[PDB]
Amino acid sequence: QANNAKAMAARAEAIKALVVSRKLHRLAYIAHPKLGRRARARIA
Amino acid sequence: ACARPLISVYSEKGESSGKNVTLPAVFKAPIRPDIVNFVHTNLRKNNRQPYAV
Amino acid sequence: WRKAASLKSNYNLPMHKMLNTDLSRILKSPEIQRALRAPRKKIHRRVLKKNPL
Amino acid sequence: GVDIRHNKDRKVRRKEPKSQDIYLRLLVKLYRFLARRTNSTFNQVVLKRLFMSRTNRPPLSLSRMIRKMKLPGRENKTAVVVGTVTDDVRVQEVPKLKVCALRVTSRARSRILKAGGKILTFDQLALDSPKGRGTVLLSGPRKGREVYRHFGKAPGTPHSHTKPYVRSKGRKFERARGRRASRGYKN
Amino acid sequence: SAHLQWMVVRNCSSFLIKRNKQTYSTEPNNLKARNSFRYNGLIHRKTVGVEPAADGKGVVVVMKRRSGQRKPATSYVRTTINKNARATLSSIRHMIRKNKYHPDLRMAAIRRASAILRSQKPVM
Amino acid sequence: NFAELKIKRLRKKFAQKMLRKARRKLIY
Amino acid sequence: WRRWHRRVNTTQKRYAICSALAASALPALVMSKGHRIEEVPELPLVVEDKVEG
Amino acid sequence: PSRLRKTRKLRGHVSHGHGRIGKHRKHPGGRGNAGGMHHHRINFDKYHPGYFGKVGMRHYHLKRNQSFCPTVNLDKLWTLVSEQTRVNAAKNKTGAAPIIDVVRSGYYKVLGKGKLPKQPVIVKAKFFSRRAEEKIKGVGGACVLVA
Amino acid sequence: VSPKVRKVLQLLRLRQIFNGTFVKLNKASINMLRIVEPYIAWGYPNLKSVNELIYKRGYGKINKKRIALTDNTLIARSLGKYNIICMEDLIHEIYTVGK
Amino acid sequence: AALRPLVKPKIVKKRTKKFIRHQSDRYVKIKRNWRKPRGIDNRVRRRFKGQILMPNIGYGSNKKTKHMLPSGFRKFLVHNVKELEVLLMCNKSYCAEIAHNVSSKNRKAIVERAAQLAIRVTNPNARL
RNA sequence: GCCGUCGCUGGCAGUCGGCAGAGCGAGAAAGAGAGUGGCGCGGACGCUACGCCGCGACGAGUAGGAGGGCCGCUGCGGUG
Ligand SMILES: [Mg+2]
Ligand SMILES: [Mg+2]
Ligand SMILES: [Mg+2]
Ligand SMILES: [Mg+2]
Ligand SMILES: [Mg+2]
Ligand SMILES: [Mg+2]
Ligand SMILES: [Mg+2]
Ligand SMILES: [Mg+2]
Ligand SMILES: [Mg+2]
Ligand SMILES: [Mg+2]
């Protein structure tokens, strides 16, 4: 328990310190139900 | 399955005698046509007479 | 149900497996009707395959 | 012709209760609807367990139900068993339980209620837990039957602790030859 | 309950007729003589029956009241209607839709009524 | 008020048609 | 010495008597048994104790 | 009933379900348990080890009343007395323990399986197991022997 | 049919006479075709053959059923996660042996 | 002028000949009622060409036109006027056949009441 | 095309009607959500839920096994 508790803090401290074609792509973007929602509004 | 209304008691003239009886609990018991048919089937065999050649 | 039989040494009414047998009230109740997905009552019959060529 | 085998085409499983009980089938009607019209896998499990046979629905004792409802994080959850809840005399203190069962023995009913608990039927679980939320589905010991003491390696094979079928138990009944080295052999 | 009572009589009833790969129910207040949960005329709290009048003129509409479910003597209210053909049907339609009394039997009641009135015309 | 609700339905039916329209152009 | 007779558990036989009594109080079931009870005033039909004499 | 049995479905099928080759002959293999040490040896050895031979002393004129000794475990001990017997003893303060007489309940020996509630009790029995007496003594009780 | 040929024909899904499938070639698969050599006619199809095989006789395995490919939504609902949303994408993934 | 059903679909029969039992043409003791041949060498059982045919579920009739009389109706045996009035609401698809052993007197009531209800009777001109 | 079997342990209790508002087969998670502030009186069938409906595959058979028979025979309790 002492060793496991000790290593958890040592592990956490390190982590906390450390932290095809342009046309077809465009259409595939617009046809996407979510991302092209603002673009489809534009065309209409 | 918890209602126990009052049941009329009728006079011999076919009219409500004004008296009442709460419905007995037994009339709310589960209706099991298959327990009945099992029990009837096996009990009706018990008044038979043997036959043999 | 509350009082055991008095003229039978040890007996009481058989317990109910299903207390509310009104299946229509149960199904139509709001509580169950909130948990259901919308019915899919559209019929998709077989499509005759026409040759695209 | 198609090179295939048909011996396994027909799946062996229950689509309905063998029982002709009308109250059970009214519950199967109820949970056939809930299983179909709700995405709750719990309803499918309960719907399936209503078709099962008597030996596939072992009785759940009070002591086993108390143990499994005491595990951490199962507080105020309704214990659900598609079967019978039998009383356990070996239990001393019965905690407040909420339970749903097909049957509860007469003594198990008094102990649960006298402790302040609540006993439900399955038609009441639907009106309270339509999708089975906040439920703890529990099952009795399936292998807790005398038959399974007789299944496995035949009793006359090495390291087989299978129970033999004897008409009587005692010194004279299947203990001489094959069960001790002094008589022929043992395994 | 209806569903409990239907599970006792669905295949065991003095009114049940099984013959020629068909099935019928001969009890009163069944609008189509059909061994069906919907059209059974005994198990529901609300039922609609249409019969020819005692004399071959008009129909008798039978409605089950709400209170006396266990009291057969006073459970059914019988109304005789002997108007023209279009008025007889109009009354039944209103007796069902306006009161919201078993609305799912509206056309069965109307179809049965048209058949009794038709049978009361002179034969050719 | 149903008039408010109806427009919501129509703008969704128009939205699905535009998504369908753009999908046809992509496969084209 | 064919086995003409059958044992039926007392608990089940009593069950079968509760099911019969419960069913006897429902007009639909008593009608469906062929009985003409279309004009009896009530179900169950209870008459005064005078008829016992 | 005979209407639900195989015979009704086997009408018209020659052999009645016993095969055309082997047929149904009278007693192939012998009658009863014939052949245990012979053509039926595998079944007996496989499924009935110990069947043949003798083991242990004979005892002429065994009287099974002499060895009557029904047993009860400790986990069932408190069922031999009413419920209010236990609750009254648990809540009283003078320290008085109830007497559980297992002979009156039809038992002679007390066995040790299970655990007892933390409640003193005086137990009367003809026999005890060693673990029964320890467990009974661990809750503040005593073991009383009767003849 | 011999046991080894019978297994290999089942892996190719050719359980019936005059059944057809596409097989992407490599050491693993080319040696399988050698085992079933007396039981199969095979070769290299051209773009037209892939077209007409999939348009006239193209059926999808959708929920373990044989559904004709009468709509693009059939292909998209199953192979859409791989960017295959039309019969033309399907013909390109087959003909070019895509990822 | 006879009553007509709601619809009259074309009735298709896969087979109209009866299935005569094997070798029932050779003996009077063998009635033509079908019996599945079960002899080991029986060539009818083995489905040899040019031999008697065996019935099998493949011959089944279209579920839609099954049990349909050539009139387009489906019969239903009736023994009295009360049984007749169960067909009141299905009189465009089911007709009434009066049982053989109903007295000639009572056939007048059933054949009469059926006329009133527009229910078709298969055998109205019998036992006159 | 039709019959049956098997599988989808597939769909239908939503017939939610003037105390009304008809949909949820659609490539791609989860609400046709709830709000707080800045004239006619009308609308087919259905659902013996052990029922009804849909879609896909399949179907040789001795010995043998199992299922269903609104197949047939005699007598008993109910019912018609
Ligand atoms: Mg085939
Ligand atoms: Mg086979
Ligand atoms: Mg098999
Ligand atoms: Mg055979
Ligand atoms: Mg022989
Ligand atoms: Mg056999
Ligand atoms: Mg043999
Ligand atoms: Mg023998
Ligand atoms: Mg041969
Ligand atoms: Mg076959």
| Degrees, nearest 5: CA angle J74-J76-J80 | 150
- Residues in chain B, how many? 53
C-alpha R_g of chain A: 24
Check if D108 contacts C (Cβ < 8 Å): no
* Residues of chain D numbered 156-175 and touching chain I (CB < 8 Å): none
Q: Is D155 in a helix, a strand, or coil?
A: coil
Q: Helices I27-35 and I3-11 meet at what angle, rounded to 10?
A: 130
CB contact under 8 A, E4 and D22: yes
- The alpha carbon of E37 is separated from its chain's Cα centroid by a whole number of angstroms, namely 13
Cα gap G45→B11, rounded to integer Å: 11
Tokens representing E46 are 């609300």
C-alpha J44 to ligand 9 mean position (Å): 13
Q: Is G11 in a helix, a strand, or coil?
A: helix
| Plot region of H35 (φ>0 → left; ψ -120 to 50 → alpha; else → beta) | left
Tokens representing J50 are 């040019």
Tokens representing D122 are 């399955």
First-residue to last-residue Cα distance in chain D = 52
Contacts of I10 in chain D (CB under 8 A): 3
Handedness of CA I1, I6, I9, I14 (dihedral sign): positive
Cα gap H69→H110, rounded to integer Å: 10
Cα gap H67→H126, rounded to integer Å: 13
Element (H, E) at D119: strand D118-120
CB atoms within 10 A of CB E89: 19
Residue among D83, I79, E22, F7 nearest J67 (CA): E22
Q: For A1-44, give the DSSP string.
A: -HHHHHHHHHHHHHHHHH---HHHHHHHHHTSTTTTHHHHHHH-
CB contact under 8 A, F22 and A44: no
C-alpha I19 to ligand 3 mean position (Å): 28
Cα gap F23→A28, rounded to integer Å: 8
Experimentally determined by = cryo-EM
Element (H, E) at F13: helix F3-27
Contacts of E84 (CB under 8 A, 6+ apart): none
- Chain I residue closest to D3 (CA)? I15
- Inter-residue contact H95 to H114 (CB < 8 Å): no
Q: How far is CA J37 from CA C15, D43, D77, J34, J54, in A?
A: 56, 50, 64, 9, 9
Using the structure block, give the residue that is written with the tokens 């009241």.
E65
Q: Residue H111: beta bridge partners?
A: H73
D67: amino acid identity, one letter: R
Alpha-helical segments (H) within chain G: 10-23, 27-32
Q: Which nucleotide is closest, CA of E12 to its C1'?
A: K79
Cα gap H30→H47, rounded to integer Å: 19
C-alpha H79 to ligand 6 mean position (Å): 53
- Dihedrals phi, psi of E24, to nearest 5 degrees: -135, 165
As a dihedral over the C-alpha atoms of residue J20, residue J26, residue J27, residue J28, rounded to 10 degrees, the angle is: 60
The burial class, CB within 10 Å (0-12 / 13-18 / 19+), for J122 is: middle
CB contact under 8 A, J36 and H12: yes
- Within residues 8-47 of protein chain I, the ones with CB less than 7 A from nucleic strand K are 16
- Dihedrals phi, psi of H142, to nearest 5 degrees: -140, 155
C-alpha R_g of chain B: 20
Distance H5 CA to K72 C1' (A): 17
Handedness of CA I46, I47, I53, I58 (dihedral sign): positive
Contacts of C36 (CB under 8 A, 6+ apart): D37, D38
Note residues around ion ligand 6 (Cβ under 5 angstroms). H 17
Cα gap J62→H108, rounded to integer Å: 78
Sheet holding E76-81, edge to edge: E48-52, E59-64, E76-81
Handedness of CA D28, D32, D38, D41 (dihedral sign): positive
- Inter-residue contact I85 to I76 (CB < 8 Å): yes
Q: How far is CA J107 from CA E6, H124, J75, J102, J116, in A?
A: 35, 90, 17, 7, 14
Catalogue the long-range contacts made by H75-82 (C-beta closer than 8 Å, 24 or more residues apart).
H75/D90, H75/H113, H75/H114, H75/H115, H75/H116, H76/D89, H76/D90, H76/H114, H77/H102, H77/H110, H77/H116, H77/H121, H77/H123, H78/D92, H78/H116, H78/H117, H78/H121, H79/D89, H80/H104, H80/H105, H80/H107
- Inter-residue contact J94 to J75 (CB < 8 Å): yes
Residue among J32, E2, A20, D101 nearest C23 (CA): E2
Check if E8 contacts C (Cβ < 8 Å): no
Residue among C21, C3, C20 nearest C12 (CA): C3
Distance A2 CA to K11 C1' (A): 60
- Dihedrals phi, psi of I51, to nearest 5 degrees: -50, -65
Tokens representing J101 are 């052993």
- Inter-residue contact J119 to J100 (CB < 8 Å): no
CB contact under 8 A, E42 and G38: no
Residue among D81, D85, D15, D84 nearest D52 (CA): D15
Using the structure block, give the residue that is written with the tokens 């059909």.
E34
The alpha-carbon gap from D46 to the nearest alpha carbon of chain E, in Å, equals: 21
Q: How do strand H99-101 and strand G46-47 relate by DSSP bridges?
A: unpaired
CB contact under 8 A, B34 and D23: no
Check if I32 contacts F (Cβ < 8 Å): no
Cα gap I7→I39, rounded to integer Å: 12
Q: For B1-53, give the DSSP string.
A: -----EEEEE-TTSSEEEEEEEPPGGGGS---HHHHHHHHHHHGGGGPPP---
Cα gap D79→D135, rounded to integer Å: 6
C-alpha J40 to ligand 9 mean position (Å): 5
Cα gap B14→B9, rounded to integer Å: 10
First-residue to last-residue Cα distance in chain G = 46
Distance D70 CA to K67 C1' (A): 47
Q: Residue H124: beta bridge partners?
A: H101, H144
D11: amino acid identity, one letter: K
- Inter-residue contact I90 to I75 (CB < 8 Å): yes
The burial class, CB within 10 Å (0-12 / 13-18 / 19+), for J92 is: middle
Check if I16 contacts D (Cβ < 8 Å): yes
Tokens representing J26 are 């050779």
**K5 closest protein residue (CA to C1'):** D10
Instruction: Report the residue from B28, B38, B46 with minimal CB separation from G22.
Output: B28
Contacts of I78 (CB under 8 A, 6+ apart): I60, I62
Residue among I72, I1, I78 nearest I39 (CA): I1
- Chain C residue closest to D30 (CA)? C23
| Plot region of E107 (φ>0 → left; ψ -120 to 50 → alpha; else → beta) | alpha
Cα gap E70→E54, rounded to integer Å: 26
Q: Is J25 in a helix, a strand, or coil?
A: coil
Contacts of B14 in chain G (CB under 8 A): 41
Contacts of I33 (CB under 8 A, 6+ apart): I23, I40, I42
Cis status, amide bond into G44, omega within 30 of 0: yes
Tokens representing G43 are 């179900």
The alpha-carbon gap from E70 to the nearest alpha carbon of chain B, in Å, equals: 10
C-alpha H20 to ligand 9 mean position (Å): 12
CB contact under 8 A, D23 and B30: yes
Contacts of G18 in chain C (CB under 8 A): 13-14
- Inter-residue contact G40 to E72 (CB < 8 Å): yes
The subunits that touch chain A, with at least 3 C-beta pairs less than 8 Å apart, are F
Contacts of D20 in chain B (CB under 8 A): 34
Alpha-helical segments (H) within chain I: 3-11, 27-35, 47-57, 72-79, 87-95
**Does residue C21 reach within 7 angstroms of strand K, measured from its CB?**
no
Tokens representing B14 are 């076919």
CB atoms within 10 A of CB J53: 12
C-alpha J14 to ligand 2 mean position (Å): 25
b/e map of J1-20 (b: 16 or more CB within 10 Å)?
eebebeeeeeeeeeeeeebe
Cα gap I75→I83, rounded to integer Å: 10
Contacts of D20 (CB under 8 A, 6+ apart): B34
**Does residue E99 reach within 7 angstroms of strand K, measured from its CB?**
no
The subunits that touch chain B, with at least 3 C-beta pairs less than 8 Å apart, are C, D, E, G
**Does residue J65 reach within 7 angstroms of strand K, measured from its CB?**
no
A16: amino acid identity, one letter: K
Residue among C46, G23, B11, D28 nearest I70 (CA): C46
Q: For chain H, give the DSSP string.
A: -GGGSHHHHTTT-GGGGS-SSS---S-TT-STTTTTTTTTHHHHHHH-TT-SS--S---SS--TTTT---EEEGGGGGGGS-HHHHHHHHH-SS----EEETTTTT--EEE--S---S---EEEESEE-HHHHHHHHHTT-EEEE--
Cα gap E68→E45, rounded to integer Å: 10
- Bases on strand K under 7 Å from any protein CB: 1-18, 23-29, 32-33, 41-50, 53-73, 76-80
Q: For J42-70, give the DSSP string.
A: -TTTTT-TTS-----GGG---TTTTT--T
Residue among D75, D103, D71 nearest D87 (CA): D103
CB contact under 8 A, E17 and J86: yes
Cα gap J97→A16, rounded to integer Å: 92
The burial class, CB within 10 Å (0-12 / 13-18 / 19+), for H81 is: middle
Q: Residue E78: beta bridge partners?
A: E62
- Inter-residue contact A30 to A40 (CB < 8 Å): yes
Contacts of B26 in chain C (CB under 8 A): 13
Q: How do strand H122-125 and strand D78-86 relate by DSSP bridges?
A: unpaired
Cα gap C22→D124, rounded to integer Å: 12
C-alpha I3 to ligand 7 mean position (Å): 34
Cα gap E38→H28, rounded to integer Å: 62
CB contact under 8 A, A44 and F18: yes
Catalogue the long-range contacts made by I12-21 (C-beta closer than 8 Å, 24 or more residues apart).
I12/I36, I12/I40, I14/I39, I14/I40, I15/D2, I15/D3, I15/D4, I16/D1, I16/D2, I16/D3, I20/I53, I20/I57
